[PDB]
Design a protein around this ligand. Structure first.
Ligand SMILES: Nc1ncnc2c1ncn2[C@@H]1O[C@H](COP(=O)(O)OP(=O)(O)OP(=O)(O)O)[C@@H](O)[C@H]1O
Ligand SMILES: Nc1ncnc2c1ncn2[C@@H]1O[C@H](COP(=O)(O)OP(=O)(O)OP(=O)(O)O)[C@@H](O)[C@H]1O
Lengths: 285, 285
């Protein structure tokens, strides 16, 4: 079926740089014909080819095109000129979830519960499509103008077919033990990251911290971390059921019978899971 | 490039009927996996085939798929089962513009100007793609939750290639004289409808009214109508430059040098055309 004409650089008025990565730069752009604002990720083809990143850029596009859920950054269009590729993405006006963690120090119980629930809901959708994020972190969980989450950064995701993996290792503080021991990744690897994120929301800092990566990995494989006295009891119990060395024993994984038991955890008692994105997010402190 | 899986009836929880047409019924539906609300237009295949409406249903889908502008109802997806076709459309929460005309009687100058400007902007986009609506009317100009317009009903549109036409005749009160005399339609036919709509917004009733269709057509070809004393002066001048029998002399048409002169009309003096959908619509009385 016919689709709109392929867009081009001239159709936009580019503005400020929203972010810079190793193989891309995201720029805020206003489409002239509609006045719509998009976050356009620009990637130089030559650099991508030189560093053998074609599989990653291709995967990012393919995975995003398959996602159709309110808690994920949307890919509206793509186009390219002689030197660059352009991905038209939804513009998450409020930035990274990490920004708010730093801004207010830590989230109260109500805000922790709400945002954790949205992340859990997003992961259920993602995992339901046999996709592993592999680099889930506050930096990758953006916030739209209404303060609902919008997860992004899928170039390093893993699309399951069988849960084999290997090759990529996400941000050190959120790396699961299986990636360091067996060099493998599965859906449960994301649940481990979830556990670190919940801990970070409540404590204000991720569970495993150290002077360098080697030391962080060392703490991870030994499950070396502890909870501060204040930590919300039910949240602590949940984290303990997520930060489990054995990937088959993490609440939410297939061997633990899926998302049902996870969403039924006491910490989420007052959560209505059916329409989170229609709910008004609690105000951050 | 991969796309989401084809949706199906079971993916939705259908609700109330939003509207009923001769070959379709629009139903409010909530997608289970996202809690998103869509207005799903359902059309029975057998009926469509019996009445030879395949060209119309096909055109509706094709035209909508080509539109990517904030002032038009969006087509998100399509699917079908053994008996029906389903079009997933954006849900215009506030209904038809006609509803508000009846609700408050008539629009003040500020509201008339704002909504007329959005319609003009929508038509510029539509015409820029060589598409003639052919049945533009308050009933076809919906309003989203933010009170910005969303034009719909494209099955009877005409996609230009050369401005030939003929075959279909829209709602009597908005029919242009060329359709009644030469049995032809062009972009300017929509501008005539625009003139009737502006008049209706200000007067509260369309320009040409009568007991039946024959009498309405009779008044149209004779340009038989008049303005009530109150009518905003500049709005009147604009309408007089739109309701012109000769289609090549309507403000906004190609022979009159396009949308530039139309948007520059005195009635729109204080209008900023670049970002109308980013502006807060004036409150209706
Ligand atoms: N859709 C978006 N809306 C608003 N901001 C965004 C969006 N996408 C990305 N950003 C911002 O731009 C930054 C850079 O994104 P990009 O994908 O180009 O590199 P990165 O993934 O952050 O780093 P790298 O790819 O090297 O790991 C992000 O960290 C984020 O702050
Ligand atoms: N996207 C939408 N969102 C909300 N309401 C809608 C939407 N589309 C249509 N409607 C409502 O449903 C009604 C019926 O639409 P439909 O296209 O099924 O028939 P119609 O075009 O109104 O009549 P006919 O096709 O016989 O001329 C519309 O008049 C409008 O009131």
């Amino acid at each position: 079926p016919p689709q709109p004409r392929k867009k081009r650089p001239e159709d936009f008025k580019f503005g400020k740089i929203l972010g810079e990565g190793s193989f891309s730069t995201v720029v805020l752009a206003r489409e002239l014909a509609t006045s719509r604002e998009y976050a356009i990720k620009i990637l130089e083809k030559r650099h991508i080819i030189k560093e053998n990143k074609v599989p990653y850029v291709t995967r990012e596009r393919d995975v995003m095109s398959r996602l159709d859920h309110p808690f994920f950054v949307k890919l509206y269009f793509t186009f390219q000129d002689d030197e660059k590729l352009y991905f038209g993405l939804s513009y998450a006006k409020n930035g990274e979830l990490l920004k708010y963690i730093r801004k207010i120090g830590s989230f109260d119980e109500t805000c922790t519960r709400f945002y954790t629930a949205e992340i859990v809901s997003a992961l259920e959708y993602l995992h339901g499509k046999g996709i592993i994020h592999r680099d889930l972190k506050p930096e990758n969980i953006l916030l739209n103008e209404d303060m609902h989450i919008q997860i992004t950064d899928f170039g390093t995701a893993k699309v399951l077919s069988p849960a084999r993996a290997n090759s990529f290792v996400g941000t050190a503080q959120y790396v699961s033990p299986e990636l360091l021991t067996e060099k493998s990744a599965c859906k449960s690897s994301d649940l481990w990251a979830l556990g670190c994120i919940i801990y970070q929301l409540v404590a204000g800092l991720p569970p495993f911290r150290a002077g360098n990566e080697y030391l962080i990995f060392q703490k991870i494989i030994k499950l070396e971390y502890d909870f501060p006295e204040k930590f919300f009891p039910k949240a602590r119990d949940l984290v303990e059921k997520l930060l489990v060395l054995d990937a088959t024993k993490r609440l939410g994984c297939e061997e633990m019978e899926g998302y049902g038991p996870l969403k039924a955890h006491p910490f989420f008692e007052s959560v209505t899971w059916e329409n989170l994105h229609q709910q008004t997010p609690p105000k951050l402190t």
